[PDB]
Amino acid sequence: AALNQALEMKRQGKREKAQKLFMHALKMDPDFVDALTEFGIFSEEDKDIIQADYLYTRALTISPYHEKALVNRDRTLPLVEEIDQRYFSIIDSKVKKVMSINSALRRVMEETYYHHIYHTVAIGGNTLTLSEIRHILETRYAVPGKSLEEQNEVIGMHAAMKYINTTLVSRIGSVTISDVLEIHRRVLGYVDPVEAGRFRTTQVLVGHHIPPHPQDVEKQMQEFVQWLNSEEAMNLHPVEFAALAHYKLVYIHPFIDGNGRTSRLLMNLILMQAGYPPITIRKEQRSDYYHVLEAANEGDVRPFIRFIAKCTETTLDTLLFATT
Amino acid sequence: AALNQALEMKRQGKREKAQKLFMHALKMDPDFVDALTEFGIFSEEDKDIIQADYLYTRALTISPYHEKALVNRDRTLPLVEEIDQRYFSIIDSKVKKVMSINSALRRVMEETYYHHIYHTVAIGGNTLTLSEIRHILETRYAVPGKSLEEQNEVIGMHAAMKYINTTLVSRIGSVTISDVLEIHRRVLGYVDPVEAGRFRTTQVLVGHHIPPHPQDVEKQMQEFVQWLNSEEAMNLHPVEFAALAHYKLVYIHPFIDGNGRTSRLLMNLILMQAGYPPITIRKEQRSDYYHVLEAANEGDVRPFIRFIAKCTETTLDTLLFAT
Ligand SMILES: Nc1ncnc2c1ncn2[C@@H]1O[C@H](COP(=O)(O)OP(=O)(O)O)[C@@H](O)[C@H]1O
Ligand SMILES: Nc1ncnc2c1ncn2[C@@H]1O[C@H](COP(=O)(O)OP(=O)(O)O)[C@@H](O)[C@H]1O
Ligand SMILES: [Mg+2]
Ligand SMILES: [Mg+2]
Predict the structure, then answer these.
(1) Candidates 1.25.40.10, 2.60.40.10, 3.40.50.300, 1.10.3720.10; correct CATH number of B1-85?
(2) Which residue intervals of A164-299 are DSSP H helices?
(3) Backbone interruptions in chain B following residues (C to N > 2.5 Å)
(4) What architecture (CATH level 2) is domain B86-323?
(5) Does the C-beta of B40 come closer than 6 Å to ligand 2?
(6) Is the CB of residue A7 less than 8 Å away from at least one CB of chain B?
(7) Radius of gyration over alpha carbons of chain B, in Å?
(8) Structural domain boundaries of chain A?
(9) What one-character DSSP code corresponds to residue A197?
(10) First CA to last CA distance, chain B
(11) Which of A79, A154, B13, B202 is 20 to 30 A from A34, comparing alpha carbons?
């Protein structure tokens, strides 16, 4: 197709012109095996092995026998595994630095409470400012010219995090379906008391994702909590357990609304129980965040794990410098 | 005691001075049999047979053999039953007039929705104005410089009444414990999602009333719903059924908060199912409303029935401005 115009562009200069052409041929057919493999080869020239591996991996799901994809993937597979493991060790060192501290840290922890609430509500459509959120939580008084629903999302958030810290963080034992229901009960409660802490009764659509049918949600969730308490899940790197737990919940989509808020909170319960700080996916990241989740639906869960690992690194930085 | 000073004050003028003295002797001993009976006699001179009869009935619970209380109660008892029955027939006629109507009525019906919400929340401490309540329900936008909890009480009310009208009013069959839980779920939901539609786990105090222990709430409520569906309850005058349902639920006090709001709503479900309009206990009535509830706890549920019957008459009067 337009891939031939891309390859000719790569040969003798025109890198930017070639990259745009590759994107066009993939925009028409994102299942175009030869376009994926050629773009993967092109990505390695920019030192982007991670993307190249995804491109080669994506092609081998379409055509599991493509020779050019195969010979390249067989080289990128263990290499990327090593690149990702090294990043998780960088994260582990920054956690050692953060968990080796106090008054300097306390000031950061209070600043980030309103920051976590602002971004978890703003990522789902909420118009309230950090200043408006601070007014609501400190005063208990309403913000003028702003809907009551948007303000009850904030009261719900505060209550859910207060419940996790008080009841769930320091708690010894297995995580149950009821613990998940108690989080949502608070997240959605002040907004929708009828649906809060209750599963979806209807079939819904999340972007291009069609979650399990309401008849299957109970079996899917019982299987989910089993995985949370399974030995293999506890053997995973905490940053991997947290992203997988988040993804898996957001996929099941057990509730009408508040599935992301609950999932981003369950993720933070996981991290914290492993001695990691709570993390925030900023409202500006919605596009990549949605893209990586979409990529995980398509078969590759890795770009989401990396997105979560990057949010954890950026949270660990910020903490380090405000205490350095 | 000071009753002798009260009795002498009655002899030759000084009515106001004698009445205050009677109140003082009752403020010291509210179980003083001779003070109750003599105030009962005194009340009849003012044409208040209803209160005189309350006084004689109160004395006969303390001393079930007091001759002066007995001879008077035997006379006032069937007389009061006649006075109360006549009032219920006045109410019945005003319901016939109201349910024989339209544009004149429609204007009243809409104004009473916001009016019922304003008084049910204002009676429990809520500072929101009728105009602020109208803003919240019509716009879905918050009222500035007013707490979020006060505004979520209003959202809860609207949802609860919407659920009763849509699901409960025109529904055929028996009322369940779950229907009561569904009303409270909406009344309290937006304020306290944790406790909404869930029974008290702790023992509480309501004024001077100590409701059943949380261990007993389920048995007390199962007995309550049985009475709601019982033949004897359906045989009562609708204004009496509604007054008693409310008293019985508010006595049990099954929830941490929202007991009065659910009770005043359950009472309106009863009235409406009997073709009566919904009624409102105005915020200015909290004092009498509580006095009459305290009095029902003390053994006499009649002054609360009359309180409810008067609220129903005043509601029927506003609607009769249309004819
Ligand atoms: N393709 C997808 N598949 C699964 N989950 C997705 C997809 N795209 C977005 N999501 C998730 O769906 C959630 C949005 O649904 P929602 O229940 O309304 O969450 P919230 O209301 O708490 O903001 C977000 O957590 C997002 O992570
Ligand atoms: N002495 C009493 N005995 C029983 N119930 C009472 C007494 N005094 C008041 N009540 C009832 O208790 C209610 C207050 O309880 P509450 O849970 O706070 O209801 P709400 O918050 O909806 O107003 C009042 O509405 C009244 O109906
Ligand atoms: Mg949403
Ligand atoms: Mg109260």
Answers:
(1) 1.25.40.10
(2) 177-189, 217-229, 231-235, 238-252, 259-273, 286-297
(3) 101
(4) Orthogonal Bundle (1.10)
(5) no
(6) no
(7) 22
(8) 1-85, 86-324
(9) T
(10) 55
(11) A79
